[PDB]
Structures are given as C-alpha cells and as structure tokens.
Design a protein around this ligand. Structure first.
Ligand code: ZN
Ligand code: ZN
Ligand code: ZN
Ligand code: ZN
Ligand code: ZN
Lengths: 73, 302, 112
C-alpha cells in the first residue's frame, strides 16, 4: 500500500532485487514469476524485462485488416 | 546442529582446492599431479565424473568458476607463471593464457557480474593485474587494463560483491612475508570514476603477523561491509563509509580456538556463517548470536 | 501431386521431408520463400546480426528467458501482443497452469 514516494528510494529497490537473485539461485522460478506478477500490480513504477522483437521486412516498423498482413505495410 | 558425512568420490592424489558453481550442481577439484576434474550431480543425489585433463608445467594452486550468464568458463593459476581460461564445447578447451607475469602466481578471482567479465591476478613479486574481455563473443581476446603495486609479497585477493549504485569497485590484498620488521599486511584499493584509476584507501595497521587468506561478505543490502582475516587468530572487521572515501574500522571477533595457523576462510550465500579450517585438522563454523555477538556454533573433525 | 495429396491429409512432417530430399531444383527451393525473420532489440530499436545473441550497442543480452533467466541460443517462442517470450517448452509448461505473462506485465497472452 505504500505510496510511490516511498517505493522510489534506492534502498527499497535493492532488497527486492537481492530477494529475486536469492530465489533464482535455488531455481524457484515459478515462485519468482508469481512474485513478479504480484509486484507489477502492487506498484506501477517498475519495468518488465526488455527483450527482442520482430520487424516487417520491407516496412521495418515493428509488427506488434488481414491477420497475415503487416500492420502498416 | 551440524552433522558430517563422507561423499562417494575417488581421487588418485592429494587435493589442493575445491570450488562450486552458481547453482550448486557442479564442481572442480585441482589435484597434486597437475590434473583437474569436474564432478556433476544427478537428481538421485550422487556425484559422477565428466572430465579430467593435465594443464600446467607445475603445481596448480587454485581454480574457480564464473557466472553462468557468460558461458561455462573456468580459471586456473600455477607455479609456472601462468593463468589459463577454459571453456566447454563435452571436452574443455583452452582459450587464453596470461604470460605477462615474471614470478609465481598465487591467486586468481572473477569480478562481479554487474561490471562485465573481468579478472584479477596477483603474483609473488607484489603486483596485481586486472584483465578484461571487450566482447563476450570471443574468449581469446583479453586486454590488460590496470596495474597496481603493493611493495610486499602477495598471498590473497578478494572482490567486493556489492552491486549498489553508491559503491565504487574495491579490492583487497594481503601479505605473508615473515620479516622481523613490523609493517602493515592488508591493503584496500578503490576505483575513482573521475580520474579512472585505482588508489589506496586504507591499511589495517593492527595486523603485523603474516596473513594467509582474506574474504568479504555478501552485502545483501546492508549499510556497511564485513571482512575476515586468516592469521594466527581469526579476526572479523567492519568497514563503514562516512559521508577515496573515509572509512570507520572496528573489531568484533578475536577467536582463538585453533592453537594453530588458520588457512582458509569462506562465507555462505547470505553472509551470516563463517567457515575456518586450521592446522589442527578440524573445521569450525561461527555465526552471530541474537545479540550481535559472534559465538562458535559447531566443531567438525576430519 | 504427391505433396498436394499429403498436404490435404495434414501430414506436414513427411511433406517437408520430401522437399528436403527431392532431386528437383524447383521443389527443393520451394522451402525458402520468405522463411527468415528479422529481430531487433527493444531497448535500442536496432537490428541485430545473424549469428549473435548480444546487442552491439547496448551490450546486454537481449534474448533472456522470462522464466529461466538464462541465454536462449536455440528456439525462441514469442508473443505478438506484449513482445515477451523465451524458451519453447518453458513457456509451454508455464501457460498450462496460468494465464498471465511470465514477465509480469498484466497481459492475458491467450485471451483467457
Ligand atoms: Zn511494413
Ligand atoms: Zn539494443
Ligand atoms: Zn528458460
Ligand atoms: Zn508480457
Ligand atoms: Zn503477450
């Protein structure tokens, strides 16, 4: 319930990362996934993991109204 | 509260050092006859072997692992003035050698993951070298980055595992010279971002006897640091920064339960229990009590 | 004619094995009409090379399993709504017992 002013401390966000690393050391991966699902709801200031994504070959602009057609091309 | 058991492993010659991986499922044991082994484990709970090879031209002293997010890298240092880097293709291959030394090499350690893939190596002449790999694609390309002189024979190094945004990278190195003259034995350095170099931070002048090992403690979000010293008596310090950076230094442990010379120090994952192996053939574990006082919590005999 | 008959009965694992081994040039080349993908990095929005897994600008592993948090060298399942994914079987096992994206972005990745 704590407001966004308390969660923005650079000390609260170190404990969470340490806990996540501890969980990953024991390979409790689904537990970590559930914890992440809970956290991303309890505060909106965090950011989910950034990964790869695919592109339109001619367009170039990030595919993400025929369902087999580029969104812009 | 601690019991003992014997692991089902067969070795031809005497062992020198043993290390674990990140998850605790692999292993590496350097031996007396210049042979290292890999000891993998199964769901049932038994250790099998996977590899064995001969590496150097002299006795091998220490081996260590590296973080899994880079590969399956190892690291070994010998008396032949070299330190090698291995990988996994089910047969391990050599990928780089570090020949830039001019005397016996005594320690090799891997930097924390939060700063890339680096390496630290000290020699008996009194010098440490910090290596790096510009790309994580080619493990045959390494470059020498930093050079630090200590003016004393080197015996052990240790990194600071902290990964905060308000802690500069720091290292610690100890000496073991048995000279009659009294002088400092443990030194601490730190890296200054503004000038991009390593400078002296503090010298623990309270120690004059030879030091045989040094280990830091996983920070786990604490407001200070913890250090352990391996000498004629086990000592535990506490380095706290005051807003190079000035430090406040204390003492919280002066155990003498060995009547001998301690030889190895190592912490656990959280940073609350300590392991000390001495010259009496027994391993003793220490842990802080409920009133922030360090009290022995088990004797194990070999 | 054989390939058409096989495709009618929905036996792809043999239809494509014929294409892999057939002695004719046209039928062999029939396999490689727009079967290559281009994947870039979401942090920097720049295309990646052909035989690598690390971004050349950000210098970070862009292909990380959202579940196992390791490096994905082989096959990589991907989702078109929130751009999250990872190992094939890890994601398949996860979605059997839940309906939320493993990365934790509030996306029902199957429309329930
Ligand atoms: Zn397009
Ligand atoms: Zn990028
Ligand atoms: Zn995975
Ligand atoms: Zn998602
Ligand atoms: Zn999705």
């Amino acid at each position: 319930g704590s407001p966004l002013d308390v969660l923005k401390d650079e000390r609260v966000q170190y404990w969470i990362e340490n806990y996540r690393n501890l969980l990953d050391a024991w390979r409790f991966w689904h537990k970590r996934a559930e914890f992440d699902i809970h956290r991303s709801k309890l505060d909106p200031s965090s950011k989910p993991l950034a990964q790869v994504f695919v592109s339109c070959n001619f367009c170039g602009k990030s595919i993400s109204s025929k369902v087999t057609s580029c969104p812009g091309c | 509260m601690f019991v003992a058991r014997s692991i089902a492993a067969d070795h031809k010659d005497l062992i020198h050092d043993v290390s674990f991986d990140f998850h605790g499922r692999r292993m590496a044991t350097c031996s007396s006859d210049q042979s290292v082994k890999v000891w993998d484990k199964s769901e049932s709970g038994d250790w099998h072997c996977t590899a064995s090879w001969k590496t150097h031209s002299g006795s091998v002293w220490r081996v260590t692992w590296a973080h899994p997010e880079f590969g399956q890298v190892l690291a070994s240092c010998s008396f032949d003035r070299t330190a090698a880097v291995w990988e996994e293709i089910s047969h391990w291959v050599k990928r780089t050698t570090l020949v830039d030394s001019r005397t016996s090499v005594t320690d090799v350690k891997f930097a924390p993951k939060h700063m890339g893939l680096m390496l630290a190596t000290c020699s008996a002449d009194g010098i440490v070298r910090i290596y790096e790999a510009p790309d994580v694609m080619n493990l045959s390309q390494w470059s020498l980055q930093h050079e630090i002189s200590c003016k004393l024979s080197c015996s052990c190094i240790s990194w600071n595992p902290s990964s905060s945004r308000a802690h500069s990278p720091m290292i610690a190195v100890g000496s073991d010279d048995s000279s009659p003259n009294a002088m400092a034995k443990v030194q601490i350095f730190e890296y200054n971002e503004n000038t991009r170099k390593y400078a002296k931070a503090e010298t623990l002048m309270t120690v004059t006897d030879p030091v045989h090992d040094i280990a830091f403690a996983p920070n786990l979000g604490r407001s200070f640091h913890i250090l352990a010293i391996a000498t004629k008596d086990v000592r535990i310090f506490t380095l706290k920064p005051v807003r190079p950076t000035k430090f406040e230094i204390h003492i919280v442990a002066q155990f003498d339960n060995h009547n001998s010379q301690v030889w190895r120090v190592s912490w656990n994952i959280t940073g609350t229990v300590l392991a000390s192996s001495g010259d009496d053939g027994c391993v003793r574990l220490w842990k802080a009590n409920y009133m922030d006082n360090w009290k022995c919590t088990g004797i194990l005999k070999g | 004619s054989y390939i058409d008959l096989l495709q009618r009965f929905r036996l792809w694992n043999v239809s494509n094995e014929v294409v892999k081994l057939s002695t004719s040039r046209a039928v062999s080349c029939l396999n490689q009409a727009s079967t290559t993908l281009h994947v870039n990095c979401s942090h920097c929005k720049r295309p990646m090379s052909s035989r690598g897994w690390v971004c050349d600008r950000c210098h970070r592993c862009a292909s990380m399993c959202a579940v196992c948090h390791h490096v994905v060298k082989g096959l990589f399942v991907w989702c078109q709504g929130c751009s999250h994914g990872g190992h094939l079987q890890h994601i398949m096992k996860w979605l059997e017992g839940s309906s939320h994206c493993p990365a934790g972005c509030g996306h029902l990745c199957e429309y329930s």
